[PDB]
Amino acid sequence: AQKSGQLFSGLLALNVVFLGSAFISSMIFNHVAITLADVWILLSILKVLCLCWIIYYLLGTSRQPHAVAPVWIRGSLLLFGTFSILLNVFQIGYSVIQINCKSKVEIVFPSIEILFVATQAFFLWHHSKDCIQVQHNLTRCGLMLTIATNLLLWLLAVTNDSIHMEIESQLRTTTCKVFQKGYILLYPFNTEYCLICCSVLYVMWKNVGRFGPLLGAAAVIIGICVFMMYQIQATGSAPNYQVFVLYYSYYIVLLPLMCVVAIIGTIIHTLEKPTRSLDVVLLMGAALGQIAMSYFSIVAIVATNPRDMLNSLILSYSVLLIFQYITQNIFIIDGLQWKRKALKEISFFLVLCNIILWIMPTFGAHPVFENGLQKSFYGYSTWFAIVNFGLPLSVFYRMHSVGGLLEVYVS
Amino acid sequence: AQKSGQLFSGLLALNVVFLGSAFISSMIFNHVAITLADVWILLSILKVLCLCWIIYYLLGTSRQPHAVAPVWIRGSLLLFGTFSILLNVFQIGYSVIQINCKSKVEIVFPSIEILFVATQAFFLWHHSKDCIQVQHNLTRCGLMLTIATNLLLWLLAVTNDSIHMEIESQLRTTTCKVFQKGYILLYPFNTEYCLICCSVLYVMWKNVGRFGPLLGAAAVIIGICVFMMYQIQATGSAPNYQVFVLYYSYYIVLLPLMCVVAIIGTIIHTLEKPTRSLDVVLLMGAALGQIAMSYFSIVAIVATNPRDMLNSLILSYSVLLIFQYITQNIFIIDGLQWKRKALKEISFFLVLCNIILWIMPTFGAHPVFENGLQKSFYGYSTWFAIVNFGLPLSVFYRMHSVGGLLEVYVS
Ligand SMILES: CC(C)CCC[C@@H](C)[C@H]1CC[C@H]2[C@@H]3CC=C4C[C@@H](OC(=O)CCC(=O)O)CC[C@]4(C)[C@H]3CC[C@]12C
Ligand SMILES: CC(C)CCC[C@@H](C)[C@H]1CC[C@H]2[C@@H]3CC=C4C[C@@H](OC(=O)CCC(=O)O)CC[C@]4(C)[C@H]3CC[C@]12C
C-alpha cells in the first residue's frame, strides 16, 4: 500500500532525473544545440514547482494532525545554506557590475536560486523528523521532485566548468576581483549543500513519510595555521611552490598517525568481546569519491615521472589517504557494535582530526586542483568533474564520520 | 563474523575495480600515456589470477565436504559464452590474416580471453548453487577478484571504441570482410556475457558463499521476419532507408499493444484482492539503461528538427519504450505478490513478446546506433558508450522479465 506509491513517486523522480540529466549531458556534449540558459529555464521551472509545493506544505499541510544526528546535520545545513546564499549573491554581483553589457537573463535565475536555498533551509530546519500522515502521495511526489531538483543542481554544479574557465581567461579590479575570489572560494559550499539536502530529504521520505584531546587540539591548531597560510597565499595570487609542500607534509604527518591509531583501535576491538545500514552505506558511498579521485591521482603520477619533491608527496598522500579511509572505515564499522579510556582517547583524537579535516577540503582553490599534474593529464573539464564529484563527498564523509566517532566516544 | 570478511573481500574488490577503472579512464582521457596494451597486460594478469583461483577451486576446493532461475540463466550463459569464444576467434583471425605486419602481442591477450571465457563458463555451469564451507575467506577474495575482472572487462567493452572506429576507417576482401562482419555482429555477446557472469558470481558470493499464445507466436514470427530482413540488409552493405522504417514501425505496432496489455493486467490486479528484493532491484537497474538511452534519444530529436518520416518514429518509439518499460515493471512488481485465464493469456503473450524482444537488440549494427541522428549529436565515442551501456542492460532486462513473467504465468 505504502511501497506502491513509494514506487510511483520513484518513477516520477527517475523520469525527472533522467530528463534533466539528458539536458545537462547534452549541454556537455552537444554544446551548440542545448544552451545553459535552457538548463536554467528547466531548473527554474522545477525550482518554482518545488517552491509552490513546500509553500503549500508550510501553509496548509503542516496544520492538520500529523504523527507525533539532530545537532550537526542541521548546523551544517544552515552553514552551507548561508554560504550558498552568499555564493549566489557573489554570482549576482559578478553578473551586474563588471559585465554590464548584458540583458536581464542572468539575474533572475540566481534570484530563484537564492529563494530556493532560503526556504528549503527553513523548511528542512523544522520539518525533518515528522512523519507526514494527511497527504501521503502528494508529499512523496513533492519530496521526490525536490530530490530530483537537488540532484540536477548537484550534477550541474559538478559538470559546470563555464564560469570557472571564464574567470581564468581574464587571469591570463576594485570589486570584481573580490567577487571572483569569493565565487571560487565558495563554490564547493553549494555543491555540498545539495548533498546535505539530498540526504535529509531522502530520510524524510524514506523512514519518515509513511591526553588524547591535547594532541588532537594541537592537530586542529596546526591544521588551522597551515590552512590559513595556504588560503592567504592562495587568494592573493597564484600562491607559491612551498605552500603546497607545507600542506601536503602536514597531510603526511597527520594521516599516518590516523592510520596507526585506527589500526590500534581495531586491534583493541579484537581484544574485547535500518539506521546502522544507512550509516554503513553512507560511509562507504562517501568514501568512494575520495578513493576514486586519489586512484586517478596515483595513476596520473606513476604514468608520468615520480620522484620530484612534492610529486612524491602527492603520491604518498594519496596512498595514505586510501589507507586512512580504509582503516578508519574498518574502525567505525567495528565500533558500531585501561581499554575503555584508551579507546576514548582514540575516538576523541580522531574526532578532532576529522573536524580539522572537514573544514579544510571545502574552500575552492584546493591543491588537488591547483597542480599542473592531474590537470594536463586528464584535462581541465574532466578533472574539474572528478574534483567536484569527490571533494564534497569527502566533506560529507568527514561530517558523517564525526557523527559516527562521536557515537563511538560515548559508547 | 561472516560480514566482516565479506567487507574485506569487498575492499579488495573495490580497490581492484577503482585501480583498473583509473587505468581504463586514463586510456580514454590521456591516450598518449596509457596504451591499450597496458590495459591488456593488467587484465591479463588479473585474468590469470582468476584462472589459478578457479582451477585451484575445481581441483582442490570442490572435493572436501561443502554444504548440501536454473534453466535460462545457465542456457544464456552457455549461449553468450559460446558466442564470445567465437567473437574472440573472429578477433584473432582479424588480427593474423589481414594485418600481417604485426608482432606477437595481439594474439596472446585474446587467447587468455578465450581460456577465461571457457573455464569460467564451465565453472559457473556446475558450481552455482553450492554454499562453500571449507575455505570461506579465500573463496570470497577469489569471487570478488573475478567480479572485479568481469566489471573491468565490461567497462573496457563499453568504452572500447578502438576497433569499431578502425573497421569503419577502411569502409570509407575474401575473408577479412567475413571477420569484420562477424566481429561487429557478435560484439554485444561478450558485453552481455560479462553482465551474466557478474550476476551469477554475485549470487554465489552473496547468498551462497556463507488465443493469447496465438497472437504471441504471430508477434514472434513477424519479429523474426523483420529481424532477418534487417540483418540480411545490414551485413550486406550500409543497409537502406526503408528497413529502418520497417523495424521501427514493427516496434510502434508491438509496443503500444504491450503497454495496453500491461495496463489492463494492472487493472485486473487491482480488481482482485531477499529473492524478491534482488528481483526488484535487477528489474529497475536493468531498466535504467534503456530508459536513459531513450531519454538521450528524445532530447536529441527534439533539440534538432522532428517531423521527418522515421525521425518521428524514433521519437514515438522511445516514448513508447519508456512507457512500456514502466507499465511492464508495474505489472511484474504487482504480479509477484474469467480473471485467471485472462491474466494467463496476458502473461504468456508478454513472455513471447519479451523473447522476440530479447533476441533482437543483441546483434551489433542496431538502428539506434546506425542513424546519423544521435551520432553527430553526442558523437561516436559518447554514443558508443551510451549504446553499449544500455543495450546489454536491455537484453538483461528482457531475460530477467522473461523469468519473472514465467513465474507470473504459473501463479
Ligand atoms: C546521480 C543521478 C545522475 C542518477 C541517480 C538516479 C536516481 C536519482 C533515480 C534513478 C532510479 C530511481 C529509483 C528507481 C526505483 C525505485 C525503487 C522504489 O522502491 C520500490 O520499488 C518499492 C516497491 C516495492 O518494494 O515493491 C523506490 C524509488 C526508487 C529507489 C527510485 C528512486 C530514485 C532513483 C534511484
Ligand atoms: C562499475 C564500476 C566502474 C564501479 C563499481 C564499484 C563496485 C565494484 C565496488 C565499489 C564499492 C564496493 C562495495 C563497498 C562496500 C561494500 C559493503 C560490504 O558489505 C558490508 O559492509 C557487510 C558488513 C556489514 O554489513 O556490517 C560488501 C562489499 C561492498 C558491497 C563492496 C563491493 C564492491 C563495490 C560495490
Task: Determine contact, residues A195/A396, Cβ cutoff 8 Å.
Answer: yes
Instruction: Give the angle A352-A355-A359 at the CA atoms, nearest 5°.
Output: 145
Instruction: Give the angle A40-A43-A48 at the CA atoms, nearest 5°.
Output: 120
Cβ contacts of B277 on chain A, cutoff 8 Å: none
**Closest residue to atom 23 of ligand 1, CA basis:** A3
Give, in order, the Cα–Cα distances in Å from A57 to each of A91, A140, A149, B15, B231: 30, 12, 17, 45, 56
* In B97-211, alpha helices (H): 108-126, 136-159, 162-170, 176-206
Buried b (16+ CB within 10 A) or exposed e, B124-142: beebbeeebeeebebbbbb
Cβ contacts of B333 on chain A, cutoff 8 Å: 7
- Please name which ligand lies nearest the alpha carbon of B145: 2
| 3 state SS for B188-233 | HHHHHHHHHHHHHHHHHHHCCCCCHHHHHHHHHHHHHHHHHHHHHH
B26–A378 C-beta distance less than 8 A: yes
**Closest residue to atom 18 of ligand 2, CA basis:** B7
Q: Choose among B393, B248, B380, B276: nearest CA to B335.
A: B276
Closest-lying ligand 1 atom to the alpha carbon of residue A21: 3
Task: Determine contact, residues B374/B314, Cβ cutoff 8 Å.
Answer: no
Which residues of A make CB contacts under 8 Å with B? 4, 7, 11, 14-15, 18-19, 21-23, 25-26, 29-30, 33-34, 288, 291-292, 295-296, 298-300, 303-304, 322, 326, 330, 333-334, 377-379, 382
Long-range contacts of B279-287, Cβ-Cβ distance < 8 Å, separation of 24 or more: B279/B336, B279/B400, B279/B404, B280/B333, B282/B199, B282/B396, B282/B400, B283/B329, B283/B332, B283/B333, B283/B397, B283/B400, B283/B401, B283/B404, B284/B329, B285/B393, B286/B393, B286/B394, B286/B396, B286/B397, B286/B400, B287/B325, B287/B329, B287/B397
Ligand 2 centre to CA of B245 (Å) is 44
State which residue of chain A sits closest to B284, comparing Cα positions: A11
Q: Look up residue B370 and give its DSSP letter.
A: S
Closest-lying ligand 2 atom to the alpha carbon of residue B148: 8
Interface test with A, best of B4, B25, B155, B294 (most A CBs within 10 A): B25
CA A331 from chain centre, in angstroms, equals 23
State which residue of chain B sits closest to A7, comparing Cα positions: B330
B333–A33 C-beta distance less than 8 A: no
**Closest Cα of chain A to B32: distance in Å?**
10
Q: What is the C-alpha separation between A176 and A172, in angstroms, rounded?
A: 16
Closest-lying ligand 1 atom to the alpha carbon of residue B277: 25
A12, A17, A18: residue to mutate for ligand 1 pocket, most atoms within 8 A of CB: A17
**Closest Cα of chain A to B295: distance in Å?**
6
The amino acid that residue A372 corresponds to is: G
Residue located via cell numbers 534503456: B290
Q: Look up residue B71 and give its DSSP letter.
A: T
3-state helix, strand, coil in chain A (%, to 5): 80, 0, 20
Q: Choose among B14, B362, B410: nearest CA to B190.
A: B362
Q: What is the C-alpha separation between A138 and A182, in angstroms, rounded?
A: 39
B2, B4, B6: residue to mutate for ligand 2 pocket, most atoms within 8 A of CB: B6
- Cβ contacts of B289 within 8 Å, gap of 6 or more: B389, B390, B391, B392, B393, B394, B397
Q: What is the C-alpha separation between B259 and B321, in angstroms, rounded?
A: 9
Which cell goes with A198? Answer: 539530498
Q: What is the C-alpha separation between B257 and B222, in angstroms, rounded?
A: 15
- For the Cβ of B256 lying below 6 angstroms from any atom of ligand 2, the answer is no
Return the beta strands (E) in B239-370 as ranges. none
A22–B299 C-beta distance less than 8 A: yes
CA B386 from chain centre, in angstroms, equals 13
Q: What is the C-alpha separation between A24 and A31, in angstroms, rounded?
A: 10
- For the Cβ of B78 lying below 6 angstroms from any atom of ligand 2, the answer is no
**Closest residue to atom 32 of ligand 2, CA basis:** B10
- For the Cβ of B6 lying below 6 angstroms from any atom of ligand 2, the answer is yes
Give, in order, the Cα–Cα distances in Å from A404 to each of A278, A291, A336, B174: 12, 19, 8, 67
Ligand 2 centre to CA of A285 (Å) is 9
Give, in order, the Cα–Cα distances in Å from A141 to each of A53, A316, A399: 10, 47, 29
B284, B293, B333, B337: residue to mutate for ligand 1 pocket, most atoms within 8 A of CB: B284
Q: What is the C-alpha separation between B38 and B23, in angstroms, rounded?
A: 8
A304–B33 C-beta distance less than 8 A: yes
- For the Cβ of A24 lying below 6 angstroms from any atom of ligand 1, the answer is no
Q: Say which of B18, B326, B333 has its CB closest to residue A291.
A: B18
Task: Determine contact, residues A248/A314, Cβ cutoff 8 Å.
Answer: yes
Task: Determine contact, residues B115/B51, Cβ cutoff 8 Å.
Answer: yes
Give, in order, the Cα–Cα distances in Å from B327 to each of A11, A130, B194: 11, 32, 28
Q: What is the C-alpha separation between B179 and B185, in angstroms, rounded?
A: 10
Which cell goes with A374? Answer: 592531474
Q: How is B326-346 classified by DSSP, letter by letter?
A: HHHHHHHHHHT--HHHHHHHH
B7–A333 C-beta distance less than 8 A: yes
Buried b (16+ CB within 10 A) or exposed e, B84-119: bbbbbbbbbbbbeebeeeeeeebeebbebbbebbee
Q: Look up residue B60 and give its DSSP letter.
A: I
Helix or strand or coil: residue A274? coil
A296–B11 C-beta distance less than 8 A: no
Which cell goes with B115? Answer: 581460456
Q: What is the C-alpha separation between A322 and A87, in angstroms, rounded?
A: 31
Residue located via cell numbers 499493444: B257
Q: What is the C-alpha separation between A120 and A194, in angstroms, rounded?
A: 11
Cβ contacts of B25 on chain A, cutoff 8 Å: 296, 378
- Give the CA count within 13 Å in the CB-facing half-sphere of B149: 26
Interface test with B, best of A2, A6, A12, A14 (most B CBs within 10 A): A14
Sign of CA dihedral A254, A255, A256, A257: positive
Sign of CA dihedral A11, A13, A19, A24: negative
Q: What is the C-alpha separation between B213 and B203, in angstroms, rounded?
A: 33
Q: What is the C-alpha separation between B37 and B204, in angstroms, rounded?
A: 32
Q: Choose among B49, B348, B80: nearest CA to B198.
A: B80
Q: Choose among A60, A47, A202: nearest CA to A140.
A: A202
For chain A, which residues make up each domain, given as ranges?
Answer: 2-68+70-206, 212-409
Entry resolution (Å): 3.3
- Cβ contacts of A298 within 8 Å, gap of 6 or more: A315, A318, A319, B19, B22
A378–B303 C-beta distance less than 8 A: no
Which residues of B make CB contacts under 8 Å with A? 4, 7, 11, 14-15, 18-19, 21-23, 25-26, 29-30, 33-34, 288, 291-292, 295-296, 298-300, 303-304, 322, 326, 330, 333-334, 377-379, 382
Give the other-Cβ count within 10 Å of A324's Cβ.
23
Helix or strand or coil: residue A74? helix
Q: Choose among B285, B284, B290, B213: nearest CA to B251.
A: B290
Intra-chain end-to-end CA distance of chain B, in Å: 38
Sign of CA dihedral A78, A80, A83, A89: negative
- For the Cβ of B124 lying below 6 angstroms from any atom of ligand 2, the answer is no
- Cβ contacts of A32 within 8 Å, gap of 6 or more: none
- For the Cβ of A108 lying below 6 angstroms from any atom of ligand 1, the answer is no
- For the Cβ of B1 lying below 6 angstroms from any atom of ligand 2, the answer is no
Task: Determine contact, residues A229/A295, Cβ cutoff 8 Å.
Answer: no
B17, B24, B145, B191: residue to mutate for ligand 2 pocket, most atoms within 8 A of CB: B17
Q: What is the C-alpha separation between A189 and B296, in angstroms, rounded?
A: 30
Which cell goes with B353? Answer: 513478446
State which residue of chain B sits closest to A38, comparing Cα positions: B303
Q: Say which of A292, A326, A382 has its CB closest to residue B29.
A: A382
Residue located via cell numbers 569527502: A394
Crossing angle for the helix pair A380-409 and A162-170, to the nearest 10 degrees: 120
Cβ contacts of B39 on chain A, cutoff 8 Å: none
- Please name which ligand lies nearest the alpha carbon of B10: 2
Intra-chain end-to-end CA distance of chain A, in Å: 38
- Please name which ligand lies nearest the alpha carbon of B156: 2
Sign of CA dihedral A403, A404, A406, A407: positive
